[PDB]
Design a protein around this motif. Structure first.
Motif, PDB file in Angstrom:
ATOM      1  N   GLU A 113       1.223  -1.363   0.412  1.00  0.00           N
ATOM      2  CA  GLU A 113      -0.288   0.242  -0.047  1.00  0.00           C
ATOM      3  C   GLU A 113       0.811   1.114   0.175  1.00  0.00           C
ATOM      4  O   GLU A 113      -0.082   2.182  -0.252  1.00  0.00           O
ATOM      5  CB  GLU A 113      -1.390  -0.108   1.116  1.00  0.00           C
ATOM      6  N   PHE A 147      -6.060   6.238 -11.326  1.00  0.00           N
ATOM      7  CA  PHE A 147      -6.774   6.133 -12.532  1.00  0.00           C
ATOM      8  C   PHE A 147      -5.135   4.762 -12.935  1.00  0.00           C
ATOM      9  O   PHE A 147      -5.523   4.060 -13.110  1.00  0.00           O
ATOM     10  CB  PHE A 147      -7.304   6.793 -13.039  1.00  0.00           C
ATOM     11  N   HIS A 150      -3.945   1.936 -10.744  1.00  0.00           N
ATOM     12  CA  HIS A 150      -4.717   1.398 -10.416  1.00  0.00           C
ATOM     13  C   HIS A 150      -4.950   0.330 -12.245  1.00  0.00           C
ATOM     14  O   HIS A 150      -5.654  -1.318 -12.061  1.00  0.00           O
ATOM     15  CB  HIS A 150      -6.835   1.774 -10.087  1.00  0.00           C
ATOM     16  N   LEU A 151      -5.175   0.968 -12.933  1.00  0.00           N
ATOM     17  CA  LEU A 151      -4.950   0.603 -14.255  1.00  0.00           C
ATOM     18  C   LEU A 151      -4.207  -0.761 -14.215  1.00  0.00           C
ATOM     19  O   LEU A 151      -4.146  -1.713 -14.762  1.00  0.00           O
ATOM     20  CB  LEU A 151      -5.249   1.526 -15.770  1.00  0.00           C
ATOM     21  N   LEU A 153      -2.190  -2.005 -12.360  1.00  0.00           N
ATOM     22  CA  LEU A 153      -2.252  -3.041 -12.008  1.00  0.00           C
ATOM     23  C   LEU A 153      -4.023  -3.775 -11.591  1.00  0.00           C
ATOM     24  O   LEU A 153      -3.340  -5.205 -11.458  1.00  0.00           O
ATOM     25  CB  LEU A 153      -2.463  -2.483 -10.007  1.00  0.00           C
ATOM     26  N   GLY A 154      -4.498  -3.145 -12.493  1.00  0.00           N
ATOM     27  CA  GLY A 154      -5.938  -4.293 -13.166  1.00  0.00           C
ATOM     28  C   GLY A 154      -4.823  -5.509 -13.680  1.00  0.00           C
ATOM     29  O   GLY A 154      -5.506  -6.437 -13.858  1.00  0.00           O
ATOM     30  N   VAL A 155      -4.457  -4.470 -14.822  1.00  0.00           N
ATOM     31  CA  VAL A 155      -3.856  -5.698 -15.678  1.00  0.00           C
ATOM     32  C   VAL A 155      -2.852  -6.360 -14.983  1.00  0.00           C
ATOM     33  O   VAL A 155      -3.144  -7.403 -15.933  1.00  0.00           O
ATOM     34  CB  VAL A 155      -2.356  -4.990 -16.464  1.00  0.00           C
ATOM     35  N   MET A 157      -3.312  -7.447 -12.392  1.00  0.00           N
ATOM     36  CA  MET A 157      -4.288  -8.489 -11.645  1.00  0.00           C
ATOM     37  C   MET A 157      -5.222  -9.936 -12.004  1.00  0.00           C
ATOM     38  O   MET A 157      -4.668 -10.769 -11.576  1.00  0.00           O
ATOM     39  CB  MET A 157      -5.728  -7.815 -10.103  1.00  0.00           C
ATOM     40  N   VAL A 158      -5.699  -9.581 -13.565  1.00  0.00           N
ATOM     41  CA  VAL A 158      -6.255 -10.303 -14.153  1.00  0.00           C
ATOM     42  C   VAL A 158      -5.619 -10.915 -14.815  1.00  0.00           C
ATOM     43  O   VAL A 158      -6.032 -11.959 -14.793  1.00  0.00           O
ATOM     44  CB  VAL A 158      -6.875  -9.376 -15.503  1.00  0.00           C
TER      45      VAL A 158
ATOM     46  N   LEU B 153     -13.250  -5.757 -15.198  1.00  0.00           N
ATOM     47  CA  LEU B 153     -13.001  -6.852 -14.810  1.00  0.00           C
ATOM     48  C   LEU B 153     -11.710  -6.769 -13.537  1.00  0.00           C
ATOM     49  O   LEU B 153     -11.358  -6.559 -12.563  1.00  0.00           O
ATOM     50  CB  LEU B 153     -11.771  -8.175 -15.358  1.00  0.00           C
ATOM     51  N   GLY B 154     -10.778  -5.635 -13.961  1.00  0.00           N
ATOM     52  CA  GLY B 154      -9.788  -4.394 -13.329  1.00  0.00           C
ATOM     53  C   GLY B 154     -10.063  -3.933 -12.018  1.00  0.00           C
ATOM     54  O   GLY B 154      -9.602  -4.059 -10.957  1.00  0.00           O
ATOM     55  N   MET B 157     -11.642  -5.598 -10.008  1.00  0.00           N
ATOM     56  CA  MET B 157     -10.128  -6.499  -9.049  1.00  0.00           C
ATOM     57  C   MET B 157     -10.128  -5.308  -7.799  1.00  0.00           C
ATOM     58  O   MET B 157      -9.168  -5.860  -6.811  1.00  0.00           O
ATOM     59  CB  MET B 157      -9.460  -7.524  -9.646  1.00  0.00           C
ATOM     60  N   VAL B 158      -9.418  -4.603  -8.265  1.00  0.00           N
ATOM     61  CA  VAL B 158      -8.262  -3.344  -7.478  1.00  0.00           C
ATOM     62  C   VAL B 158      -9.145  -3.165  -5.901  1.00  0.00           C
ATOM     63  O   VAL B 158      -8.975  -2.800  -5.420  1.00  0.00           O
ATOM     64  CB  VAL B 158      -8.777  -2.171  -9.083  1.00  0.00           C
ATOM     65  N   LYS B 161      -9.939  -6.046  -2.573  1.00  0.00           N
ATOM     66  CA  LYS B 161      -8.826  -6.753  -1.728  1.00  0.00           C
ATOM     67  C   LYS B 161      -8.388  -5.689  -0.994  1.00  0.00           C
ATOM     68  O   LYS B 161      -8.357  -4.891   0.156  1.00  0.00           O
ATOM     69  CB  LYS B 161      -7.925  -6.349  -2.288  1.00  0.00           C
ATOM     70  N   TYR B 162      -8.535  -3.989  -2.177  1.00  0.00           N
ATOM     71  CA  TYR B 162      -9.183  -2.650  -2.115  1.00  0.00           C
ATOM     72  C   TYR B 162      -9.930  -2.177  -0.417  1.00  0.00           C
ATOM     73  O   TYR B 162      -9.182  -1.644   0.775  1.00  0.00           O
ATOM     74  CB  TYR B 162      -8.981  -2.127  -2.727  1.00  0.00           C
ATOM     75  N   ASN B 179     -15.788   4.855 -12.734  1.00  0.00           N
ATOM     76  CA  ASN B 179     -14.552   3.749 -12.976  1.00  0.00           C
ATOM     77  C   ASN B 179     -14.925   2.931 -14.406  1.00  0.00           C
ATOM     78  O   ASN B 179     -13.882   3.508 -15.234  1.00  0.00           O
ATOM     79  CB  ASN B 179     -13.435   2.699 -11.823  1.00  0.00           C
TER      80      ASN B 179
END
Lengths: 193, 193
Positions: A113, A147, A150-151, A153-155, A157-158, B153-154, B157-158, B161-162, B179
């Motif tokens: 974090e 944004f 996070h964008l 991070l989503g890549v 995570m997926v 999906l990201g 997902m973000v 957990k958040y 978003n």
């Protein structure tokens, strides 16, 4: 004095090649030419050493960010150079961890974090330079910054859950990396002015 | 004959209001006016009933997609209407589950991946209409389709957990939803022609 640094580096390599589980304190001791008895003076748990290695790696990211940022290219070139660097960091960590590290204990709860916040800030700073440099419109620098972070991070995570520690090829990273650009690219057009 | 459907609906509401854990087969039986003995003819486990409810909910998404898709608005308006609908689905599921459902057993392993594939396909179809309608450039319809689906999906997902099952406000969904548009919006400009 800087034997710590030796122990950390030794550790880094072991974990890079073999991971945390298969790796052994007797091994790391061997590497630095010590004895568990001595190693334990610096680290009393394989996990602790691992965290040192994570923190060394996180610092390397910042050091390289500082290079990019003091290289005086434009807001856009920096933003892209950042995405590449962020991508490669992710790569380092997956290569050290090979497990459920990202998918999560209390300590790492915090190392995540903080990084994610330092990261948003670095990015807010590039946005800010873009704003003043007049490449990007103002803009809530901060909202955007988040944004983008996070964008990306989503890549990441997926792409995990999606795969597994072992079920992961070299094309699996080409994917991460190539996606994170797409996103980068698109984000830029949302503020290019 | 369609008592199943009654049991499913009863269940849906219970789980919507109270969740899976606090909810009870003796309760659901009461609701439909039966007796556990009878309920077990249809379902022999609270989890099984829950899956029926998940599957009913997944079907409702498709039904509404069919409406949008047979409403003859343009490729863009559909894509956006989809994002809204996808968002609201996510909302339904979080409201039924309140747990570690998304963050994951073997069955759901499959209900996820099929949906995500049906979804990519629906989207590929809107892209395709856009292509022919000439709103979107061709384009790998399929690559894009995946990208949009993964992008959304990201966001989801973000945002988890958040947060946490309980630590989740009404503004927490305004966030998701707002978003997912940003992303939708940006994706559209990557193909608007």
């Amino acid at each position: 004095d800087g034997k710590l640094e030796l122990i950390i580096n030794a550790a880094q390599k072991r974990f890079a090649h073999y991971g945390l589980c298969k790796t052994t304190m007797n091994e790391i001791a061997s590497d630095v030419g010590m004895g568990k008895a001595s190693l334990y003076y610096y680290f009393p748990d394989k996990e602790t050493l691992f965290e040192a290695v994570i923190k060394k790696e996180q610092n390397v990211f910042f050091d390289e960010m500082d290079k990019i940022l003091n290289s005086g290219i434009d807001a856009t070139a920096l933003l892209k150079k950042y995405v590449k660097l962020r991508s490669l960091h992710f790569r380092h960590l997956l290569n050290l961890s090979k497990l459920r590290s990202d998918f999560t204990k209390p300590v790492f709860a915090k190392a995540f974090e903080s990084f994610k916040q330092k990261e948003v800030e670095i990015v807010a700073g590039i946005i800010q330079y873009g704003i003043t440099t007049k490449e990007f419109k103002r803009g809530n620098k901060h909202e955007n910054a988040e944004f983008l972070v996070h964008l990306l991070l989503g890549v990441r995570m997926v792409k995990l859950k999606y795969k597994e520690i072992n079920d992961f090829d070299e094309s699996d990273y080409e994917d991460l990396d190539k996606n994170m650009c797409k996103v980068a690219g698109m984000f830029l057009k949302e503020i290019q002015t």
